[PDB]
Amino acid sequence: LSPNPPKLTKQMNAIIDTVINYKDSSGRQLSEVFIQLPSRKELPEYYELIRKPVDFKKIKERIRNHKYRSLGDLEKDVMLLCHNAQTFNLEGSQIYEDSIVLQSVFKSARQKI
């Protein structure tokens, strides 16, 4: 019904940048694996298991192409990314544990703004 106000777009980018730039206690950038999806050639099981594949690259593109109409819309996709990581990977694994932290980082970034 109307274009995204520049204020909303700036917020979406500010929230996602907080998530992407987040470095843990050891000083490790947790988002590293999630920026890009795995290769269809090396990990075909992933594409067999995961209904809606989404990475941080696609999220940035959807903010850019005004695909998210609200912060709740952006949240649904960030929650999807993490759910996907947790669906494919073993509980307790580095990827699995990282997605749980990034869910928390997003919520903390959103709740601030």
Contact residues toward ligand A1I5P (CB under 6 A) are 33-34, 37-38, 55, 81, 84-85, 88-89, 95
Q: Which is nearer to ligand A1I5P, 54 or 109 (CB)?
A: 54
Q: Which is nearer to ligand A1I5P, 8 or 107 (CB)?
A: 107
Q: Which is nearer to ligand A1I5P, 10 or 36 (CB)?
A: 36
The token pair at 77 is 């996709």
d(CA 20, CA 17): 5
d(CA 51, CA 39): 16
d(CA 53, CA 84): 7
**Residue ranges at the known binding site for Zn(2+):** 66, 83
CB of 81 to ligand A1I5P, least distance (A): 5
**Phi and psi at residue 90, to the nearest 5°:** -70, 140
Residue number closest to ligand A1I5P, CB atom: 38
Q: What is the dihedral of CA 75, 97, 33, 90, to 10 degrees?
A: -110
**Residue ranges at the known binding site:** 66, 83
CB of 26 to ligand A1I5P, least distance (A): 20
